[PDB]
Amino acid sequence: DRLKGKVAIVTGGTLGIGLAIADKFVEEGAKVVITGRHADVGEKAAKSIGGTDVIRFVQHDASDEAGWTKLFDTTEEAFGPVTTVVNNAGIFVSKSVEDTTTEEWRKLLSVNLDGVFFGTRLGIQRMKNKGLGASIINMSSIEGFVGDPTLGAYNASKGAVRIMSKSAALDCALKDYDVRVNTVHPGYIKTPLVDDLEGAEEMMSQRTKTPMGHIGEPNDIAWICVYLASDESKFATGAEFVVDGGYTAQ
Amino acid sequence: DRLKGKVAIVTGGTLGIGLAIADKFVEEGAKVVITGRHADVGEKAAKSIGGTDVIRFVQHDASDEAGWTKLFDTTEEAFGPVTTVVNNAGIFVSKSVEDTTTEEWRKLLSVNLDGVFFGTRLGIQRMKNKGLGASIINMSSIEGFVGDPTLGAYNASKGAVRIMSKSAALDCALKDYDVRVNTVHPGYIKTPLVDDLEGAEEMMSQRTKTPMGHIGEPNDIAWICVYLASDESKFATGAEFVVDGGYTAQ
Amino acid sequence: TDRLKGKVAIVTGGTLGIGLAIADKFVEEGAKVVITGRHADVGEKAAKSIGGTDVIRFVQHDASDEAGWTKLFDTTEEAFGPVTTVVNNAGIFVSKSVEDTTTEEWRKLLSVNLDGVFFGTRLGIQRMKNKGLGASIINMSSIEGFVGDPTLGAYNASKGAVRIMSKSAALDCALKDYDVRVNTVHPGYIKTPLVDDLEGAEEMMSQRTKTPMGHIGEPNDIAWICVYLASDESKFATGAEFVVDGGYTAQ
Amino acid sequence: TDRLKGKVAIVTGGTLGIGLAIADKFVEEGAKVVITGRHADVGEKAAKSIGGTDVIRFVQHDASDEAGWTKLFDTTEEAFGPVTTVVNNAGIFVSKSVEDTTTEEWRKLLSVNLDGVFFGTRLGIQRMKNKGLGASIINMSSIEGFVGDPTLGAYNASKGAVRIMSKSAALDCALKDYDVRVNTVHPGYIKTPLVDDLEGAEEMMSQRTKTPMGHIGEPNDIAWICVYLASDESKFATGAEFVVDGGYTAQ
Ligand SMILES: [Mg+2]
Ligand SMILES: [Mg+2]
Ligand SMILES: [Mg+2]
Ligand SMILES: [Mg+2]
């Protein structure tokens, strides 16, 4: 029981990485609310992990600012005060900066940046000063460290999350809020997105990309998140945790 | 004449750092168009540097997407094809993430992030494949490297610029566009903003902040920009240039 | 429930402070451990303080002793089976500016903090590759592997060397399918016996301009990220840097 | 118009490649320069190839020769006046994995690439502080000070050590108002005589998976960022890293 007593919100927790985070959190004794845009998918994902005594689904788009309040209230009414927020929801656009439409730019940033801001801001307000050993875990990427010529807007969003989380981490530390803020940086992981992009896994598995020569699995990200959520990581804040098969080491 | 033949757009070039960039560019033989929101201020700034044969003002807000096209066309009609873009325009908000209003968040990001995207995207389209030795210089900050508890949105914007510029730099390199993209990261510089924030220069000059014990001057940033604009830096792309009196070294 | 079932770890400088907590929690998680140290009385007592001889043993060794590393691996293998995990934690401190550093101080620090980490990494790769052990080499760097300190010149040099050299080793092992991962851990200020001996040290480290949390860490703070890195939980993490510093490097 | 008026620079390993171009452009910008190298015939010829004895001179010196550094400063001061600029560019290459690195190779590389940079930095601070010279110490790191290379273990270690040790020295000088700045330059792949001797080297380095621009740089590419760092133009830049690598580290 490494997350005994923890109560977590995992955005985009109905598929891939987010689903695995939710799975392993529940396994380690946390109570979890997962969010998603699709109710049928979301309800099924929750039940695949456990009963309503340990996990619940809430239909929510991370860019829905007002919905964030409903998300915290619903999670609190179900499991008690929230202790853990994982801002994992996000979308992918494959365009160069040159080729990015303004509509694409705005759409992606509204989820990947504004959504994380909404979750972090409200997270700090609701969890500070309550002695919860609170932890906000913001999902960046290797794309928050290095550029990719075909991921301009994605790059922008992940670099923004990377540094904005440090700001939040320092404010919470300096004010003795008992809230930690950290970023996780996955490399290429086998997810529904990757499976659906023809040729993606093949390009990602090249040694010039991922030195291990294969892409990761959603559990690879889940376990580092269990670490950051647990009181094991009580001295870790404002830091970057990279799980990428060596992508950024070369 | 280190910028002989260069033609530069400098956004927010009517005050502080941007004004100094424009000054030293003209000094080194470049033709310059500076932009600003205020016509009286802008016209006066241009004339303070030189005549219309070497520098001109164009009234423009960097978040005005359509205006970017007018900005390139006007600069080209005046001086010939643009070779250099310095995305320097930006605003400052002093709020923690916790305390940032959504209106403040959006306003700041629209200039500091969208504006830089607009300039970079159009810059690549207009300067690629023309053999101009083109250079796009995006103004980040030390705030693109480290957090500040009271600069949440600013942090987000500067981290976004930092990584998005790498994406643009790689795309241009891989496609042999003859366009380089780099970021400059000023520490604390004596600017109209700093002069106007009561107590700011004092806090900034603490040895725990800036190891040199004083803040910089706008020319400190101008000279690194002359370097990046010139063909001297033809092998430099996707890199970060920090001029900060030691702020990030500790 | 043991997170380190079947692992066999060598922890250098494991008789005190951070090294001791690493060994403690490693044994707690089902690993067998050999700790090293320069002083036998302290070391043997340290081993017994954690558990029985069936799970933890002491070996007297200076990390700069190249020949001794072979004995360390052989002795550990003979007691517990093939080594799966190496933690290069041993190191010394010198408080001098670059300007004020004697060459004797420079060489002595580097021989332990750099050469010793090299010896352990190199031999670790040779001895653990291709055995399917889920092998993990954990090199102790520091916040001083990221940022300078005006009064820690040689220390900075050693910690930055470890930071990047580990990436080289991580890449070679990955590219060769060696089943060895290499990562660095970067502690901030931790309450250790060294810190306890320096009067006022903890107070200075706890200033918000230094450590934003306003207090320094504890050895267990480093132990738990090392358990993560040692476990198969982290099978996709290699060549990366793990910082646990109370916010020191975030500002 | 000279950007380096009044400067007096020592450039180690300045008889070939990157070091030579640094010295060349330094003299072009009004500095007086002493270049060092291990071989006198090449070195004296290298000095004359740039300019007259009133602006550039050769001194035979191995950067790992600690005692020789004092002679280097004294000889340079006697010819041109107080030294204002030091470029620690000298270094050697070993192509071995960490696993395959002999300790002799490890020690030899580190003695030049690390110890030599230390000797120059330490003495540079002692000799140039408080003289109001606009002093600048420029330490040559590399892309290998940022990222690992599986076949460059010792090189990685040395270049990461230089990267962080320079920050320590930069901080101490800043905090003490020494009027000395310390910075690191990080070349990517550059067309140098070493590269020319390795058949196929340039071709491999020019692959887009390595250098995104699809070609490698030239020594002048490094010379011009060094001119910037040497000049009073960069009076607010210290403890920072300047990367000129054709995009190598951006991906
Ligand atoms: Mg125990
Ligand atoms: Mg700092
Ligand atoms: Mg010449
Ligand atoms: Mg890379």
PDB file of C-alpha atoms in Angstrom, chain C:
ATOM      1  CA  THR C   1       5.390  -7.579  -2.235  1.00  0.00           C
ATOM      2  CA  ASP C   2       9.173  -7.094  -2.358  1.00  0.00           C
ATOM      3  CA  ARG C   3      10.077  -4.606  -5.065  1.00  0.00           C
ATOM      4  CA  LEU C   4      13.649  -5.913  -5.435  1.00  0.00           C
ATOM      5  CA  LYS C   5      13.158  -9.681  -5.391  1.00  0.00           C
ATOM      6  CA  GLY C   6      16.267 -11.494  -6.542  1.00  0.00           C
ATOM      7  CA  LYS C   7      18.481  -8.419  -6.801  1.00  0.00           C
ATOM      8  CA  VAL C   8      22.054  -8.439  -5.534  1.00  0.00           C
ATOM      9  CA  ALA C   9      23.510  -4.964  -4.941  1.00  0.00           C
ATOM     10  CA  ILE C  10      26.899  -3.443  -4.198  1.00  0.00           C
ATOM     11  CA  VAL C  11      26.584  -0.073  -2.408  1.00  0.00           C
ATOM     12  CA  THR C  12      29.837   1.834  -2.080  1.00  0.00           C
ATOM     13  CA  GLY C  13      30.270   4.025   0.986  1.00  0.00           C
ATOM     14  CA  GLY C  14      27.270   2.194   2.390  1.00  0.00           C
ATOM     15  CA  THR C  15      28.175   2.330   6.080  1.00  0.00           C
ATOM     16  CA  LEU C  16      26.830   5.815   6.792  1.00  0.00           C
ATOM     17  CA  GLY C  17      24.264   8.395   5.742  1.00  0.00           C
ATOM     18  CA  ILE C  18      22.833   8.163   2.235  1.00  0.00           C
ATOM     19  CA  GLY C  19      24.653   4.910   1.420  1.00  0.00           C
ATOM     20  CA  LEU C  20      23.383   3.279   4.596  1.00  0.00           C
ATOM     21  CA  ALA C  21      19.750   4.218   3.903  1.00  0.00           C
ATOM     22  CA  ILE C  22      20.055   2.903   0.348  1.00  0.00           C
ATOM     23  CA  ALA C  23      21.323  -0.438   1.674  1.00  0.00           C
ATOM     24  CA  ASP C  24      18.670  -0.458   4.428  1.00  0.00           C
ATOM     25  CA  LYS C  25      15.745  -0.011   2.038  1.00  0.00           C
ATOM     26  CA  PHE C  26      17.326  -2.328  -0.552  1.00  0.00           C
ATOM     27  CA  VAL C  27      17.379  -5.124   2.017  1.00  0.00           C
ATOM     28  CA  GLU C  28      13.848  -4.153   3.046  1.00  0.00           C
ATOM     29  CA  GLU C  29      12.745  -4.711  -0.543  1.00  0.00           C
ATOM     30  CA  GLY C  30      14.238  -8.170  -0.857  1.00  0.00           C
ATOM     31  CA  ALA C  31      17.711  -7.445  -2.218  1.00  0.00           C
ATOM     32  CA  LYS C  32      20.917  -8.948  -0.914  1.00  0.00           C
ATOM     33  CA  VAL C  33      23.518  -6.237  -0.351  1.00  0.00           C
ATOM     34  CA  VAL C  34      27.232  -5.726   0.137  1.00  0.00           C
ATOM     35  CA  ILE C  35      28.144  -2.345   1.601  1.00  0.00           C
ATOM     36  CA  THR C  36      31.666  -0.938   1.461  1.00  0.00           C
ATOM     37  CA  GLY C  37      33.543   1.518   3.650  1.00  0.00           C
ATOM     38  CA  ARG C  38      37.081   2.391   4.719  1.00  0.00           C
ATOM     39  CA  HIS C  39      36.632   1.446   8.376  1.00  0.00           C
ATOM     40  CA  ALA C  40      35.944  -2.105   9.454  1.00  0.00           C
ATOM     41  CA  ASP C  41      34.543  -1.569  12.948  1.00  0.00           C
ATOM     42  CA  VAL C  42      31.939   0.911  11.726  1.00  0.00           C
ATOM     43  CA  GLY C  43      31.206  -1.129   8.619  1.00  0.00           C
ATOM     44  CA  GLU C  44      30.617  -4.512  10.275  1.00  0.00           C
ATOM     45  CA  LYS C  45      28.451  -2.765  12.846  1.00  0.00           C
ATOM     46  CA  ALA C  46      26.576  -0.998  10.019  1.00  0.00           C
ATOM     47  CA  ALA C  47      25.833  -4.308   8.234  1.00  0.00           C
ATOM     48  CA  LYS C  48      24.524  -5.983  11.402  1.00  0.00           C
ATOM     49  CA  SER C  49      22.417  -2.880  12.143  1.00  0.00           C
ATOM     50  CA  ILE C  50      20.387  -3.551   8.985  1.00  0.00           C
ATOM     51  CA  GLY C  51      19.987  -7.335   8.990  1.00  0.00           C
ATOM     52  CA  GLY C  52      21.542 -10.778   9.054  1.00  0.00           C
ATOM     53  CA  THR C  53      24.505 -12.085   7.085  1.00  0.00           C
ATOM     54  CA  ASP C  54      22.076 -13.871   4.745  1.00  0.00           C
ATOM     55  CA  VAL C  55      20.987 -10.482   3.338  1.00  0.00           C
ATOM     56  CA  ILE C  56      23.718  -7.919   4.057  1.00  0.00           C
ATOM     57  CA  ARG C  57      27.512  -7.973   4.443  1.00  0.00           C
ATOM     58  CA  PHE C  58      30.334  -5.459   4.760  1.00  0.00           C
ATOM     59  CA  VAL C  59      33.502  -5.372   2.683  1.00  0.00           C
ATOM     60  CA  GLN C  60      36.387  -2.992   3.523  1.00  0.00           C
ATOM     61  CA  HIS C  61      37.202  -1.100   0.336  1.00  0.00           C
ATOM     62  CA  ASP C  62      38.153   2.378  -0.886  1.00  0.00           C
ATOM     63  CA  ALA C  63      36.285   3.197  -4.117  1.00  0.00           C
ATOM     64  CA  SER C  64      39.553   4.465  -5.669  1.00  0.00           C
ATOM     65  CA  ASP C  65      41.097   0.996  -5.194  1.00  0.00           C
ATOM     66  CA  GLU C  66      40.840  -0.363  -8.750  1.00  0.00           C
ATOM     67  CA  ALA C  67      42.141  -3.884  -8.001  1.00  0.00           C
ATOM     68  CA  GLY C  68      39.823  -4.124  -4.995  1.00  0.00           C
ATOM     69  CA  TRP C  69      36.763  -3.772  -7.232  1.00  0.00           C
ATOM     70  CA  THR C  70      37.351  -7.248  -8.664  1.00  0.00           C
ATOM     71  CA  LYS C  71      37.535  -8.661  -5.135  1.00  0.00           C
ATOM     72  CA  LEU C  72      34.366  -6.752  -4.317  1.00  0.00           C
ATOM     73  CA  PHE C  73      32.440  -8.347  -7.160  1.00  0.00           C
ATOM     74  CA  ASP C  74      33.877 -11.813  -6.528  1.00  0.00           C
ATOM     75  CA  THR C  75      33.196 -11.650  -2.798  1.00  0.00           C
ATOM     76  CA  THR C  76      29.622 -10.456  -3.355  1.00  0.00           C
ATOM     77  CA  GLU C  77      28.945 -13.134  -5.988  1.00  0.00           C
ATOM     78  CA  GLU C  78      30.304 -15.875  -3.740  1.00  0.00           C
ATOM     79  CA  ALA C  79      27.964 -14.832  -0.912  1.00  0.00           C
ATOM     80  CA  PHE C  80      24.756 -13.959  -2.767  1.00  0.00           C
ATOM     81  CA  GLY C  81      25.042 -14.898  -6.449  1.00  0.00           C
ATOM     82  CA  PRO C  82      25.573 -12.738  -9.569  1.00  0.00           C
ATOM     83  CA  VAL C  83      25.531  -8.987  -8.894  1.00  0.00           C
ATOM     84  CA  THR C  84      22.590  -7.201 -10.488  1.00  0.00           C
ATOM     85  CA  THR C  85      22.921  -3.716  -9.043  1.00  0.00           C
ATOM     86  CA  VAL C  86      25.735  -1.279  -8.428  1.00  0.00           C
ATOM     87  CA  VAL C  87      25.403   1.985  -6.508  1.00  0.00           C
ATOM     88  CA  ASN C  88      28.474   4.212  -6.848  1.00  0.00           C
ATOM     89  CA  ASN C  89      27.732   6.385  -3.829  1.00  0.00           C
ATOM     90  CA  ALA C  90      31.162   6.736  -2.199  1.00  0.00           C
ATOM     91  CA  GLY C  91      32.688  10.203  -2.361  1.00  0.00           C
ATOM     92  CA  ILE C  92      34.549  12.891  -0.479  1.00  0.00           C
ATOM     93  CA  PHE C  93      34.080  16.631  -0.041  1.00  0.00           C
ATOM     94  CA  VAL C  94      36.553  19.458  -0.407  1.00  0.00           C
ATOM     95  CA  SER C  95      35.424  23.015   0.356  1.00  0.00           C
ATOM     96  CA  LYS C  96      37.673  25.139  -1.879  1.00  0.00           C
ATOM     97  CA  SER C  97      37.150  27.501  -4.774  1.00  0.00           C
ATOM     98  CA  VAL C  98      38.738  26.508  -8.065  1.00  0.00           C
ATOM     99  CA  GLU C  99      41.188  29.358  -7.369  1.00  0.00           C
ATOM    100  CA  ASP C 100      42.100  27.952  -3.952  1.00  0.00           C
ATOM    101  CA  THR C 101      42.195  24.255  -4.818  1.00  0.00           C
ATOM    102  CA  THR C 102      45.535  22.564  -4.329  1.00  0.00           C
ATOM    103  CA  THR C 103      46.424  20.013  -6.937  1.00  0.00           C
ATOM    104  CA  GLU C 104      46.734  17.391  -4.195  1.00  0.00           C
ATOM    105  CA  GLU C 105      43.110  18.160  -3.169  1.00  0.00           C
ATOM    106  CA  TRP C 106      42.016  18.088  -6.808  1.00  0.00           C
ATOM    107  CA  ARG C 107      43.621  14.685  -7.431  1.00  0.00           C
ATOM    108  CA  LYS C 108      42.460  13.107  -4.172  1.00  0.00           C
ATOM    109  CA  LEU C 109      38.814  14.108  -4.659  1.00  0.00           C
ATOM    110  CA  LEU C 110      38.756  13.100  -8.318  1.00  0.00           C
ATOM    111  CA  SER C 111      40.345   9.719  -7.612  1.00  0.00           C
ATOM    112  CA  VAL C 112      37.402   8.771  -5.386  1.00  0.00           C
ATOM    113  CA  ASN C 113      34.496  10.763  -6.879  1.00  0.00           C
ATOM    114  CA  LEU C 114      35.388  10.214 -10.515  1.00  0.00           C
ATOM    115  CA  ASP C 115      37.858   7.351 -10.898  1.00  0.00           C
ATOM    116  CA  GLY C 116      35.984   5.219  -8.370  1.00  0.00           C
ATOM    117  CA  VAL C 117      32.684   5.743 -10.137  1.00  0.00           C
ATOM    118  CA  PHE C 118      34.433   4.867 -13.393  1.00  0.00           C
ATOM    119  CA  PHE C 119      35.925   1.656 -11.954  1.00  0.00           C
ATOM    120  CA  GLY C 120      32.541   0.549 -10.624  1.00  0.00           C
ATOM    121  CA  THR C 121      30.690   1.388 -13.820  1.00  0.00           C
ATOM    122  CA  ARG C 122      33.211  -0.223 -16.132  1.00  0.00           C
ATOM    123  CA  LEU C 123      33.442  -3.433 -14.095  1.00  0.00           C
ATOM    124  CA  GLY C 124      29.678  -3.393 -13.507  1.00  0.00           C
ATOM    125  CA  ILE C 125      29.077  -3.441 -17.260  1.00  0.00           C
ATOM    126  CA  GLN C 126      31.587  -6.232 -17.834  1.00  0.00           C
ATOM    127  CA  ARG C 127      30.205  -8.401 -15.036  1.00  0.00           C
ATOM    128  CA  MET C 128      26.465  -7.784 -15.439  1.00  0.00           C
ATOM    129  CA  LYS C 129      25.885  -7.545 -19.213  1.00  0.00           C
ATOM    130  CA  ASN C 130      23.956 -10.231 -21.142  1.00  0.00           C
ATOM    131  CA  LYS C 131      22.897 -12.131 -18.019  1.00  0.00           C
ATOM    132  CA  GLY C 132      19.255 -11.045 -18.103  1.00  0.00           C
ATOM    133  CA  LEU C 133      19.468  -9.792 -14.529  1.00  0.00           C
ATOM    134  CA  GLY C 134      17.605  -6.545 -15.057  1.00  0.00           C
ATOM    135  CA  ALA C 135      20.914  -4.932 -14.182  1.00  0.00           C
ATOM    136  CA  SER C 136      21.067  -1.342 -12.919  1.00  0.00           C
ATOM    137  CA  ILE C 137      24.006   0.935 -12.277  1.00  0.00           C
ATOM    138  CA  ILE C 138      23.162   3.920 -10.109  1.00  0.00           C
ATOM    139  CA  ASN C 139      25.721   6.668 -10.052  1.00  0.00           C
ATOM    140  CA  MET C 140      25.465   9.232  -7.315  1.00  0.00           C
ATOM    141  CA  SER C 141      25.868  12.702  -8.699  1.00  0.00           C
ATOM    142  CA  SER C 142      24.383  15.742  -6.954  1.00  0.00           C
ATOM    143  CA  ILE C 143      22.762  19.140  -7.465  1.00  0.00           C
ATOM    144  CA  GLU C 144      26.403  20.083  -7.960  1.00  0.00           C
ATOM    145  CA  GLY C 145      26.292  18.047 -11.166  1.00  0.00           C
ATOM    146  CA  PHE C 146      23.796  20.604 -12.505  1.00  0.00           C
ATOM    147  CA  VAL C 147      24.855  23.939 -11.050  1.00  0.00           C
ATOM    148  CA  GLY C 148      28.089  25.464  -9.809  1.00  0.00           C
ATOM    149  CA  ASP C 149      29.024  26.267  -6.232  1.00  0.00           C
ATOM    150  CA  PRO C 150      31.815  28.867  -5.829  1.00  0.00           C
ATOM    151  CA  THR C 151      33.274  26.926  -2.892  1.00  0.00           C
ATOM    152  CA  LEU C 152      33.088  23.432  -4.415  1.00  0.00           C
ATOM    153  CA  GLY C 153      35.315  23.559  -7.510  1.00  0.00           C
ATOM    154  CA  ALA C 154      36.690  20.003  -7.559  1.00  0.00           C
ATOM    155  CA  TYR C 155      33.359  18.618  -6.367  1.00  0.00           C
ATOM    156  CA  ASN C 156      31.559  20.322  -9.270  1.00  0.00           C
ATOM    157  CA  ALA C 157      34.086  18.920 -11.723  1.00  0.00           C
ATOM    158  CA  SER C 158      33.671  15.374 -10.342  1.00  0.00           C
ATOM    159  CA  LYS C 159      29.872  15.479 -10.239  1.00  0.00           C
ATOM    160  CA  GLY C 160      29.510  16.845 -13.779  1.00  0.00           C
ATOM    161  CA  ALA C 161      31.900  14.174 -15.044  1.00  0.00           C
ATOM    162  CA  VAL C 162      29.754  11.482 -13.439  1.00  0.00           C
ATOM    163  CA  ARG C 163      26.586  13.010 -14.894  1.00  0.00           C
ATOM    164  CA  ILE C 164      27.720  12.796 -18.505  1.00  0.00           C
ATOM    165  CA  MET C 165      29.973   9.711 -18.360  1.00  0.00           C
ATOM    166  CA  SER C 166      26.913   7.809 -17.095  1.00  0.00           C
ATOM    167  CA  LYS C 167      25.018   8.780 -20.227  1.00  0.00           C
ATOM    168  CA  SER C 168      27.812   7.310 -22.364  1.00  0.00           C
ATOM    169  CA  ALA C 169      27.654   4.012 -20.454  1.00  0.00           C
ATOM    170  CA  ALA C 170      23.835   4.043 -20.580  1.00  0.00           C
ATOM    171  CA  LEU C 171      23.866   4.451 -24.360  1.00  0.00           C
ATOM    172  CA  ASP C 172      26.432   1.732 -25.019  1.00  0.00           C
ATOM    173  CA  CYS C 173      24.499  -0.771 -22.873  1.00  0.00           C
ATOM    174  CA  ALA C 174      21.181   0.124 -24.507  1.00  0.00           C
ATOM    175  CA  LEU C 175      22.538  -0.035 -28.057  1.00  0.00           C
ATOM    176  CA  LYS C 176      24.086  -3.450 -27.340  1.00  0.00           C
ATOM    177  CA  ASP C 177      21.034  -4.947 -25.607  1.00  0.00           C
ATOM    178  CA  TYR C 178      23.218  -5.635 -22.552  1.00  0.00           C
ATOM    179  CA  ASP C 179      20.253  -5.570 -20.151  1.00  0.00           C
ATOM    180  CA  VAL C 180      22.089  -2.972 -18.036  1.00  0.00           C
ATOM    181  CA  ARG C 181      20.640   0.472 -17.349  1.00  0.00           C
ATOM    182  CA  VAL C 182      22.723   3.398 -16.116  1.00  0.00           C
ATOM    183  CA  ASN C 183      21.250   6.444 -14.404  1.00  0.00           C
ATOM    184  CA  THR C 184      22.308   9.281 -12.087  1.00  0.00           C
ATOM    185  CA  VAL C 185      20.724  10.423  -8.836  1.00  0.00           C
ATOM    186  CA  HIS C 186      21.171  14.056  -7.802  1.00  0.00           C
ATOM    187  CA  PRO C 187      20.595  14.673  -4.086  1.00  0.00           C
ATOM    188  CA  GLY C 188      20.250  18.202  -2.815  1.00  0.00           C
ATOM    189  CA  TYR C 189      21.146  18.925   0.785  1.00  0.00           C
ATOM    190  CA  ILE C 190      20.618  15.838   2.968  1.00  0.00           C
ATOM    191  CA  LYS C 191      20.974  15.500   6.750  1.00  0.00           C
ATOM    192  CA  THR C 192      24.077  13.276   6.982  1.00  0.00           C
ATOM    193  CA  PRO C 193      26.840  12.757   9.584  1.00  0.00           C
ATOM    194  CA  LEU C 194      29.089  15.130   7.595  1.00  0.00           C
ATOM    195  CA  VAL C 195      26.450  17.871   7.756  1.00  0.00           C
ATOM    196  CA  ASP C 196      25.936  17.178  11.467  1.00  0.00           C
ATOM    197  CA  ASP C 197      29.657  17.770  12.073  1.00  0.00           C
ATOM    198  CA  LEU C 198      29.611  21.153  10.360  1.00  0.00           C
ATOM    199  CA  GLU C 199      28.027  23.569  12.858  1.00  0.00           C
ATOM    200  CA  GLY C 200      25.548  25.866  11.125  1.00  0.00           C
ATOM    201  CA  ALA C 201      25.666  23.840   7.902  1.00  0.00           C
ATOM    202  CA  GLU C 202      22.048  22.689   8.133  1.00  0.00           C
ATOM    203  CA  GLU C 203      20.918  26.240   8.914  1.00  0.00           C
ATOM    204  CA  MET C 204      22.607  27.677   5.825  1.00  0.00           C
ATOM    205  CA  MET C 205      21.311  24.874   3.580  1.00  0.00           C
ATOM    206  CA  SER C 206      17.779  25.451   4.870  1.00  0.00           C
ATOM    207  CA  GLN C 207      17.609  29.095   3.813  1.00  0.00           C
ATOM    208  CA  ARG C 208      14.930  29.533   1.147  1.00  0.00           C
ATOM    209  CA  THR C 209      17.505  31.046  -1.231  1.00  0.00           C
ATOM    210  CA  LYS C 210      19.173  27.642  -1.118  1.00  0.00           C
ATOM    211  CA  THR C 211      16.496  25.003  -0.441  1.00  0.00           C
ATOM    212  CA  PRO C 212      12.991  26.365  -1.259  1.00  0.00           C
ATOM    213  CA  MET C 213      11.267  23.860   1.048  1.00  0.00           C
ATOM    214  CA  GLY C 214      13.070  25.546   3.973  1.00  0.00           C
ATOM    215  CA  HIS C 215      14.549  22.336   5.341  1.00  0.00           C
ATOM    216  CA  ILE C 216      17.070  19.770   4.153  1.00  0.00           C
ATOM    217  CA  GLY C 217      16.284  16.170   3.208  1.00  0.00           C
ATOM    218  CA  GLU C 218      16.919  12.830   4.917  1.00  0.00           C
ATOM    219  CA  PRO C 219      18.892   9.813   3.677  1.00  0.00           C
ATOM    220  CA  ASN C 220      15.659   7.860   3.099  1.00  0.00           C
ATOM    221  CA  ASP C 221      14.721  10.480   0.484  1.00  0.00           C
ATOM    222  CA  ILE C 222      17.589   9.202  -1.606  1.00  0.00           C
ATOM    223  CA  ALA C 223      16.995   5.548  -0.741  1.00  0.00           C
ATOM    224  CA  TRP C 224      13.515   5.495  -2.261  1.00  0.00           C
ATOM    225  CA  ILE C 225      14.456   6.873  -5.694  1.00  0.00           C
ATOM    226  CA  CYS C 226      17.317   4.358  -5.732  1.00  0.00           C
ATOM    227  CA  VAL C 227      14.847   1.522  -5.011  1.00  0.00           C
ATOM    228  CA  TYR C 228      12.857   2.693  -8.024  1.00  0.00           C
ATOM    229  CA  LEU C 229      15.979   2.753 -10.222  1.00  0.00           C
ATOM    230  CA  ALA C 230      17.146  -0.637  -8.975  1.00  0.00           C
ATOM    231  CA  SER C 231      13.761  -2.294  -9.586  1.00  0.00           C
ATOM    232  CA  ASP C 232      12.386  -3.618 -12.838  1.00  0.00           C
ATOM    233  CA  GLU C 233       9.743  -0.863 -12.410  1.00  0.00           C
ATOM    234  CA  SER C 234      12.241   1.381 -14.171  1.00  0.00           C
ATOM    235  CA  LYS C 235      13.062  -0.944 -17.092  1.00  0.00           C
ATOM    236  CA  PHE C 236      12.592   1.860 -19.639  1.00  0.00           C
ATOM    237  CA  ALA C 237      14.588   4.496 -17.758  1.00  0.00           C
ATOM    238  CA  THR C 238      18.235   4.867 -18.751  1.00  0.00           C
ATOM    239  CA  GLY C 239      20.701   7.697 -19.271  1.00  0.00           C
ATOM    240  CA  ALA C 240      18.476   9.993 -17.218  1.00  0.00           C
ATOM    241  CA  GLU C 241      18.969  12.260 -14.205  1.00  0.00           C
ATOM    242  CA  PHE C 242      16.838  12.030 -11.069  1.00  0.00           C
ATOM    243  CA  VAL C 243      16.890  15.106  -8.852  1.00  0.00           C
ATOM    244  CA  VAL C 244      15.605  15.097  -5.263  1.00  0.00           C
ATOM    245  CA  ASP C 245      16.618  18.445  -3.873  1.00  0.00           C
ATOM    246  CA  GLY C 246      13.724  20.250  -2.203  1.00  0.00           C
ATOM    247  CA  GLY C 247      13.552  22.614  -5.182  1.00  0.00           C
ATOM    248  CA  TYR C 248      17.211  23.729  -5.144  1.00  0.00           C
ATOM    249  CA  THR C 249      17.703  23.504  -8.903  1.00  0.00           C
ATOM    250  CA  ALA C 250      14.202  24.662  -9.913  1.00  0.00           C
ATOM    251  CA  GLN C 251      15.044  28.300  -9.079  1.00  0.00           C
TER     252      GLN C 251
END
